[PDB]
A = this chain, B = another copy of it.
């Protein structure tokens, strides 16, 4: 029934999972989220996550879309990404061309702090750290971005809009109740159609709060409260991928 996830309810429901932000950064966010939302002409802007660096100066990353339309069977959102070392001032994350988008997936290890860092890869190729961060955010968003099913609907002119009459998802424990963001409302694609053991759901029947954690990307959490229909998600931790999933499970 909600139209945009709160930044306070997300931090409250995901505090236990370690998805927390500093109090000073929380106040700075509360002040400087609308400023960037108006400076960029975006109708929706929410905090996407927080990535750890070799310094204490983690990257806070917020995403925001202005239009969201159906295109070749994919719900394409025209997202813009912004980063900030502190909660006050935001900078932009320019998209990455395919050559460097493939030369950035081979660079591993947790990032440094200064976004003006050049990695050198193999003749030597110089790649900016902001490109690597953009690649990691794109990979996590492709693999993970999760919303409850039927929470979006298709109107005339083929635009995906929130379902104002969404009554909630029965059986919140089941993974079938949740879907990726880029799945069309008509298609019956959910997280069940992913790999069998890559999503863990723990549901408290009493308080009516379900919690979905990504095991392929260990730092992605998504909560869904059903008594009042409120769902949110956050990624906290480094952006690296968990390759050896078969051994761990």
Contacts and interface: CB of A to CB of B under 8 A. Distances in A.
A187 interface: no
A151 to B, nearest CB: 13
A110 interface: no
A6 B34 CA distance: 21
Q: Copy number of this protein in the oligomer?
A: 2
A1 B4 contact: no
Interface string A1-22: 1111010110010000000000
Contacts of A229: 3
A229 to B, nearest CB: 7
B164 A228 contact: no
A38 interface: yes
Which of the four size classes fits the interface of chain A? Answer: 10 to 19
Interface string A68-106: 000000000000000000000000000000000000000
Contact of A1 (B2, B9, B35, B207): B2
B3 A228 contact: yes
A32 to B, nearest CB: 11
A206 B39 CA distance: 11
A156 to B, nearest CB: 16
Contacts of A2: 1-2, 228
Contact of A207 (B6, B34, B207, B227): B34
Interface in A24-61: 34-35, 38
Interface in A203-221: 206-207
A195 interface: no
14 contacts: A1-B164, A2-B2, A2-B228, A3-B227, A3-B228, A4-B227, A6-B9, A6-B228, A8-B8, A8-B9, A8-B12, A34-B206, A34-B207, A35-B206
User: Closest 4 CB pairs between A and B?
Assistant: A3-B228, A4-B228, A34-B207, A8-B12
